[PDB]
C-alpha cells in the first residue's frame, strides 16, 4: 500500500476529527508488584518519549506497491485455495440486516462501543443513537444508510495499547481504521455468511483461525498440521499488501459465486479515503485494518500468498499435502518434506511483502502462544501465553473498575504455564490488598474445567 495524496482536511471541506489527547492506559495497583517494560503507544506528536517524527512513523508502514499482473503462480494458488473453500458451501446470499447487525450464530452483533465513523463522528452521532440492542430497531439505521449512502471515507485512529520501548521511542504506533457504520453494515450484509462460515470452521479448510478459542483449538492444531512445521509472521503485513493481492482476493470470491458487483467492496478496502485528525489522504493498496472483515480477508489473502510462494520457489510442489492456518499475517503450517522458509521470504520480497520466519512443536508460536502437550493427557495441548506478557498486561488498566474481569481473564491464560508459575502469580496478586478482594479461580478448578471442556 502507498499514500498517493495527502492534504489539509479543511481544503476539502472535511472538519477536523477530534481524537484523544492522552492514553486511557494508567499504571494499575499491580504495577510495582510485577515487572515489565511496555508502555502506552505514543498518541501525539509532542510525546516527550519520541526519538523520531511521529506522523512519519505512523505512516511508514505504507511501504509502496509492486505493480504486477496476477501471475501464473497466483492463479494456481487461487484455484487450489478456492477448491478447499468450495467444500464449505458458503452462501453468497446477503445476510439478513437484523442478523448482520444484532447477532446470529457465528457472527457477533456489531460492536456498539467503537466509532461509527464518518459523517457520524463529525455530527456527534454515536452508534447507540442509531442502534439499540434492546429493541433491535432498524428504522433509524435504514434512514442513515439511505441518507449518507456507501463508500464513505474511513476515520484513522491511533491504537491505544501497550508497546515495547523501541516501538514507543520510534513512534511506531499502530493505526486502526473505522469504516462508516453504513459501510460496516453493508459489508456485513454482503459477506456475513462468509464471516459466519469462517468463524464456525477454524482449521485447515478455511485455512483460518479467526474467532478460535485457543483453549479448545490448540489440541486440534497438531492433528491438522502433521508434517514438517512451517511458521512465520510478517513486518507490516496489512499496509504492505499491493493491489494485485486484492485482485487475487476478488478472483477467489468470484469463484465462490460472488458477482463482480458484490466484490466491489474489495475495491473499497484496497483504494481508500481516510480522515486523520486535520488531514485527509488516499491510499492505494494496503488492508485498512479495522474495517469489516479485515482479519478474515487478511487471512484469505495469506492463504493465496503462501501457496503462490511455494509454487514459485518449489516448482513441483504438491499443494494437496500442504496445510496451513492463518490469523491475519500470523501463519502456522506444515508440509511432509522440509521447506526453506527463507527462500519463501525472499520470494515474498519480490511481491512487496516483508516475511520473518528447525521449527518444532517446542518452539513454534501462533497468536503469540506456545504449544505444550499436557503431561497427563498427551492428546490435549495447552496454549501457553508467556508469563512475561501476562505480567505486562496486569501492570496497566484502562479502567480499574474492571480489575476483576481483567485479572480473571489473565488467570485463564496463566495457569497453562503450570501450577508453580500459577501459584506464584496468584501469590504476587495477593500481595496487594485489591488482590485479596478478587475472586481468583483455583488451579485445580481451571484444570478441571479445561479437561471437562473437551
Secondary structure string (H, E, C) spanning the chain:
CEEEEEEEHHHHCCCCCCCCCCCCCEECCCCCCCCCCCEECCCCCCCCCCCCCHHHHHHCCCCCCCCCCCCHHHHHHHHHHHHHHHCCCCCCCCCCHHHHHHCECCECCCCCCCCCCCCHHHHCCCHHHHCCCCCCCCHHHHHHHHHHCCCCCEEEEECCCEECHHHHHCCCCCEEEECCHHHHHHHHHHHHHHHHHHHHCCECCCCECCCCCHHHHHHHHHHHCCCEEEEEEECCHHHHCCHHHHHHHHHHHHHCCCCCCCCHHHHHHHEEEEEECCEEEEEECCCCECECCHHHHHHHHHHHHHHHHHHHHCCCCCHHHCEEEEECCEEEEEECCCCCHHHHHHHHHCCCCCEECCCCCCCCCECCEEEEECCCCCCCEEEECCHHHHHHHHCEECCHHHHHHHHHHHHHHHHHHCHHHHHHHHHHHHCCHHHHHCCCCCHHHHHHHHHHHC
Give residues with Cβ within 8 angstroms of 309, minimum separation 6: 73, 344, 347, 348, 351
Q: At what angle do helices 419-430 and 387-394 cross, to 10 degrees?
A: 20
Are the C-beta atoms of residues 285 and 173 closer than 8 Å to each other? no
The last residue of one of the domains, among 285, 316, 347, is 285
Describe the strand order of the beta sheet including 355-356 as a list of residue ranges: 323-327, 330-335, 228-234, 355-356
Resolution, given in Å to one decimal, reads: 1.9
Let me know if 207 is exposed, middle or buried by CB neighbors in 10 A (0-12, 13-18, 19+).
Answer: buried
Asked if 303 and 384 sit in the same domain, the reply is no
Radius of gyration, alpha carbons of the chain: 23
The last residue of one of the domains, among 327, 343, 360, is 360
Cα–Cα distance measured from residue 207 to residue 224, given in angstroms and rounded to the nearest whole number = 11
| 440: containing domain | 368-454
Breaks (C-N over 2.5 A) in the chain follow: 357
40 lies in some domain? no
393 lies in some domain? yes
Rounded to the nearest 5°, which phi and psi values hold at 71?
A: -90, 180
Q: Which residues sit in the known binding site?
A: 233, 330
Asked if 104 and 176 sit in the same domain, the reply is yes
47 lies in some domain? no
Give residues with Cβ within 8 angstroms of 158, minimum separation 6: 19, 41, 42, 43, 58, 173, 174, 175, 176
Cα–Cα distance measured from residue 206 to residue 302, given in angstroms and rounded to the nearest whole number = 11
Angle, alpha carbons 224-230-232 (nearest 5°): 115
CATH number, position 450: 1.20.960.20
34 lies in some domain? no
Asked if 276 and 413 sit in the same domain, the reply is no
Cα–Cα distance measured from residue 370 to residue 393, given in angstroms and rounded to the nearest whole number = 18
Rounded to the nearest 5°, which phi and psi values hold at 150?
A: -115, -175
Asked if 336 and 441 sit in the same domain, the reply is no
The last residue of one of the domains, among 309, 330, 360, is 360
Q: Which residues sit in the known binding site for Mg(2+)?
A: 233, 330
Asked if 302 and 263 sit in the same domain, the reply is no
What cell numbers appear for 109 in the block? 452483533
Only one residue has cell 492444531, namely 221
Asked if 437 and 376 sit in the same domain, the reply is yes
CATH number, position 315: 3.30.70.270
Cα–Cα distance measured from residue 293 to residue 192, given in angstroms and rounded to the nearest whole number = 9
Cα–Cα distance measured from residue 396 to residue 161, given in angstroms and rounded to the nearest whole number = 10
Asked if 193 and 219 sit in the same domain, the reply is no
Cα–Cα distance measured from residue 228 to residue 326, given in angstroms and rounded to the nearest whole number = 17
Q: How far is CA 266 from the centre of its chain?
A: 17
Asked if 252 and 238 sit in the same domain, the reply is no
Cα–Cα distance measured from residue 412 to residue 253, given in angstroms and rounded to the nearest whole number = 37
Asked if 268 and 416 sit in the same domain, the reply is no
65 lies in some domain? no
Q: Give just the sign of the alpha carbon dihedral 301, 304, 307, 310.
A: negative
Rounded to the nearest 5°, which phi and psi values hold at 201?
A: -135, 60
Cα–Cα distance measured from residue 80 to residue 411, given in angstroms and rounded to the nearest whole number = 41
Give residues with Cβ within 8 angstroms of 449, minimum separation 6: none
How many residues are given for the chain? 454
Experimental determination approach used? X-ray
With helix as H, strand as E and coil as C, how does 119-164 read?
CHHHHCCCHHHHCCCCCCCCHHHHHHHHHHCCCCCEEEEECCCEEC
Question: In angstroms, what CA-CA distances link 440 with 31, 61, 91, 107, 342?
Answer: 18, 41, 44, 31, 45
What cell numbers appear for 408 in the block? 480473571
Cα–Cα distance measured from residue 93 to residue 196, given in angstroms and rounded to the nearest whole number = 12
Asked if 255 and 106 sit in the same domain, the reply is yes
138 lies in some domain? yes
How many Cα neighbours within 13 Å face the side chain of 243?
12
Give residues with Cβ within 8 angstroms of 378, minimum separation 6: none
Asked if 234 and 247 sit in the same domain, the reply is no
Amino acid at each position: 500500500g502507498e499514500i498517493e495524496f495527502i492534504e489539509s482536511s479543511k481544503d476539502a471541506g472535511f472538519p477536523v476529527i477530534n481524537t484523544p489527547s492522552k492514553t486511557k492506559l494508567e499504571p494499575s495497583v499491580f504495577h510495582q508488584v510485577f515487572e515489565g517494560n511496555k508502555e502506552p503507544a505514543v498518541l501525539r506528536s509532542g510525546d516527550p518519549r519520541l526519538k523520531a517524527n511521529f506522523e512519519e512513523a505512523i505512516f511508514s508502514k505504507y511501504i509502496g506497491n509492486v505493480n504486477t499482473h496476477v501471475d501464473e503462480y497466483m492463479l494456481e494458488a487461487v484455484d487450489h485455495y478456492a477448491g478447499q473453500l468450495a467444500t464449505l458451501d458458503i452462501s453468497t446470499e446477503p445476510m439478513k440486516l437484523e442478523d448482520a447487525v444484532y447477532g446470529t450464530e457465528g457472527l457477533e452483533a456489531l460492536d456498539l462501543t467503537t466509532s461509527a465513523g464518518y459523517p457520524y463522528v463529525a455530527l456527534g452521532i454515536k452508534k447507540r443513537d442509531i442502534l439499540s440492542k434492546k429493541t433491535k430497531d432498524l428504522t433509524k439505521l435504514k434512514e442513515c444508510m439511505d441518507k449518507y449512502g456507501l463508500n464513505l471515507p474511513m476515520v484513522t485512529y491511533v491504537k491505544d495499547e501497550l508497546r515495547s520501548i523501541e516501538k514507543v521511542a520510534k513512534g511506531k504506533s499502530r493505526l486502526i481504521e473505522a469504516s462508516s457504520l453504513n459501510d460496516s453494515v453493508a459489508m456485513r450484509q454482503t459477506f456475513g455468511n462468509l464471516y459466519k462460515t469462517f468463524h464456525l470452521n477454524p482449521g485447515v479448510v478455511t485455512g483460518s483461525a479467526v474467532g478460535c478459542d485457543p483453549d479448545l483449538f490448540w489440541s486440534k492444531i497438531p492433528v491438522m498440521l502433521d508434517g514438517h512445521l512451517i511458521a512465520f509472521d510478517y513486518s507490516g503485513y496489512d499496509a504492505s499488501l499491493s493491489p494485485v493481492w486484492f485482485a487475487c482476493l476478488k478472483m477467489i470470491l468470484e469463484k465462490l459465486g460472488y458477482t463482480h458487483k458484490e466484490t466491489n467492496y474489495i475495491d473499497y478496502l484496497c483504494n481508500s479515503h481516510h480522515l486523520y485528525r486535520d488531514k485527509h489522504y488516499f491510499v492505494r493498496g494496503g488492508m485498512p485494518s479495522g474495517c469489516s472483515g479485515t482479519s478474515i480477508f487478511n487471512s484469505m489473502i495469506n492463504n493465496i500468498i503462501i501457496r503462490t510462494l511455494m509454487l514459485k520457489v518449489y516448482k513441483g510442489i504438491d499443494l494437496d499435502q500442504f496445510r496451513m492456518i492463518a490469523y491475519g499475517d500470523d501463519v502456522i503450517a506444515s508440509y511432509p518434506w522440509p521447506i526453506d522458509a527463507s527462500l519463501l521470504a525472499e520470494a515474498g520480497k519480490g511481491y512487496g511483502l516483508i516475511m520473518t520466519p528447525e521449527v518444532t512443536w517446542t518452539n513454534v508460536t501462533f497468536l503469540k502462544r506456545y504449544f505444550r502437550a499436557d503431561e497427563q493427557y498427551p492428546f490435549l495441548v495447552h496454549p501457553v501465553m508467556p508469563m512475561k506478557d501476562i505480567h505486562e498486561s496486569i501492570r496497566w488498566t484502562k479502567d480499574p473498575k474492571n480489575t476483576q474481569d481483567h485479572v480473571r481473564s489473565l488467570c485463564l491464560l496463566a495457569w497453562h504455564n503450570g501450577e508453580h508459575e500459577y501459584e506464584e502469580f496468584i501469590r504476587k496478586i495477593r500481595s496487594v490488598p485489591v488482590g485479596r478482594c478478587l475472586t481468583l479461580p483455583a488451579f485445580s478448578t481451571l484444570r478441571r474445567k479445561w479437561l471437562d471442556s473437551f
